[PDB]
Amino acid sequence: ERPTFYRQELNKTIWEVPERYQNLSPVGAYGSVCAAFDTKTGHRVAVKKLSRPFQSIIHAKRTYRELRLLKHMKHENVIGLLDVFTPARSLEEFNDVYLVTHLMGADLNNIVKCQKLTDDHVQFLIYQILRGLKYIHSADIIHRDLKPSNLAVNEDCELKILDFGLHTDDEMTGYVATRWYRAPEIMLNWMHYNQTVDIWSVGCIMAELLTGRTLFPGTDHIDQLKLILRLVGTPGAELLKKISSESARNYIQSLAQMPKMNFANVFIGANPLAVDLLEKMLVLDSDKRITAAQALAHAYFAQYHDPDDEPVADPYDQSFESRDLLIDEWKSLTYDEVISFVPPP
Ligand SMILES: N#Cc1ccc(CNC(=O)N2CCOCC2)cc1
Ligand SMILES: [Cl-]
Ligand SMILES: [Cl-]
Ligand SMILES: [Cl-]
Ligand SMILES: [Cl-]
Ligand SMILES: [Cl-]
Ligand SMILES: [Mg+2]
C-alpha cells in the first residue's frame, strides 16, 4: 500500500514525496508550496509542506484543525483535499505533513483589474460564492477571511473558495487589503461574532466587482470605521445595546450621527436588483443581515438559482475545539487522520 518516496532539496528545504508527483517547482510562515504534476491523475497540483507542525500545543492543534477541515470540504465551489501524506512509517518517527490540492491560476483580483465585467459576470461570480458559503455555513464553519485573493477563478468564470481562516496585529495594521473586507464587529471586537461576518465580506467584494474599486480602503482601523459609517449610517440605540465592549460603545457615541446614504447614487448605473441586494448585505447590525441561503433566492440570481442543486454539508464534529490536550496527543490524532485518508473518486 505504501508508495515509494524520493528526496530533493528545494530552496534550502528537503522534500520527500511519492514518485507520482513530478517536476516540483517552488511557488511560495506556516509552510512552503511547490507546483507539481500528478502522474496518477493528470492534474497540475499544489504540494504544501507544513513548517514545524508540532512545535507547540498551539501549532499542533492548528495542524489538526486544518487537516480536519480540508478532509471535510466536498463542494464544487470550495477547495478540496486531493491527497495528504507523510514519509514516516510509524507514529514514533512522524514529523512532517504534506497537503495536496488543485493548482489555482488567477484570483478575483486579476479578474477585476484586467477584465471588463458585465452584469451577467457579476451575477455568476457572486452566485458561486454564496453557493459555497451556504455549504460552509451549514457545517457551522465560519470562513473569516473572505477577500479577492482567496477566490480562484478559471477561464470559464468558475470560482472556488480557498484559504480558510485558521492573523497577527501587524498584519491588520494600516493601508492593507487584509482588513478592508472585515466586518466592523470583528475589526473592532464589539461582540462575539458569528457566521454573518462572512456576508459583510461578500457585500464588499460584490461592490468592488460593480465599480472596479475597493469599497472601504481605510488607512487604519479608525479611518475605515469612518468610511463604513458614512455609507451605512451611525448605529442606533438597538445596536449600541448589543456592543458588550463598554469602551467601544463609548467611542462610537463620540461620533456625530449620520444617516444611511442612497445606494443608487453611490453605485451609479448598477442593476437596481444589485443595489437592493447590497442594501441587504451591508447592514451594520449583524442580526439583520441576509443569510447565504436567503440570498440565493434573491431575484438578482434568477437565471442561475436552482434550489435542487445547492447542497449542504454532512454534519461536522468540532468538539475538539474546546478540548485541552498535550502536544503528543494532538500529534497522534493528526497521524490517525493522515493514514485514514481516502482519495476522491
Ligand atoms: N482518524 C480518523 C478518522 C477517520 C474517519 C472517521 C469516520 N469515517 C469517515 O468519516 N469516513 C468518510 C470516508 O470514508 C470512510 C468513512 C473517524 C476518524
Ligand atoms: Cl507513487
Ligand atoms: Cl477542489
Ligand atoms: Cl516524517
Ligand atoms: Cl485580496
Ligand atoms: Cl465530523
Ligand atoms: Mg490567501
User: Counting atoms of ligand 1 from 1, which one is nearest the CA of 337?
Assistant: 1
Which ligand is the nearest neighbour of the Cα of 6?
A: 2
Q: Under 8 Å CB-to-CB from 340, ≥6 apart: which residues?
A: none
Neighbours of 321 (CB within 10 A): 9
**The three cell numbers locating residue 28:** 511560495
Q: Is 48 annotated as a binding residue?
A: yes
The residue range of the domain holding 129 is 108-301
User: Counting atoms of ligand 1 from 1, which one is nearest the CA of 336?
Assistant: 1
User: Counting atoms of ligand 1 from 1, which one is nearest the CA of 340?
Assistant: 4
CA distance 170 to 149: 19
Cα(137) to centroid(ligand 3), Å: 18
**Structural contact between residues 202 and 129, judged by C-beta atoms closer than 8 angstroms:** yes
CA distance 154 to 134: 21
Mutate to test the pocket of ligand 1, among 63, 335, 340 (most ligand atoms within 8 A of CB): 340
Which DSSP helix (H) or strand (E) runs through 247?
helix 246-252
Experimental approach taken:
X-ray
78 dihedral zone (left: phi>0; alpha: psi -120 to 50; beta)? beta
Q: Look up the CATH number of the domain holding residue 211.
A: 1.10.510.10
CA distance 53 to 191: 31
Cα(71) to centroid(ligand 2), Å: 21
**Structural contact between residues 73 and 314, judged by C-beta atoms closer than 8 angstroms:** no
Q: Under 8 Å CB-to-CB from 68, ≥6 apart: which residues?
A: 320, 337
Is the Cβ atom of 337 under 6 angstroms away from ligand 1? yes
Torsion angle defined by CA atoms of residues 145, 148, 151 and 153, in that order, rounded to the nearest 10 degrees: 180
Residues labelled as active-site residues: 163
